């Protein structure tokens, strides 16, 4: 008798889709990715800044 919107009303967000619990609790709406040092070679920036 009422559409309830899972994106509000946490009761429903949990009723569909548990792991909502896990999601929130583990954050991972955040969650920094790891840190890599790859640098673009040479020609790439040579042509990037080209005329």
């Amino acid at each position: 008798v009422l559409k309830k919107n899972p994106l509000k009303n946490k009761q429903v967000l949990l009723r569909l889709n548990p792991y909502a619990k896990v999601f929130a609790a583990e954050k991972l709406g955040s969650k920094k990715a790891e840190k890599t040092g790859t640098k673009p070679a040479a020609v790439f920036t040579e042509t990037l800044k080209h005329d």
Partner: protein, 53 residues
């Protein structure tokens, strides 16, 4: 293609593997890595108006 389809289904049933005899349309495309070795992007510019007459 029905000959080809019948024979495809046979070599599949003899080996007991999946059929898929209905053509699919062209699918969008797949990820590529194009290289720069030998091909350096040669940059282009629009051209001034010119009369040729």
């Amino acid at each position: 293609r029905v000959k080809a389809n019948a024979a495809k289904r046979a070599e599949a049933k003899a080996q007991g593997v999946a059929v898929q005899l209905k053509r699919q349309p062209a699918q969008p495309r797949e990820s590529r890595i194009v290289s720069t070795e030998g091909n350096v992007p040669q940059t282009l510019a629009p051209v001034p108006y010119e009369t040729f007459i």
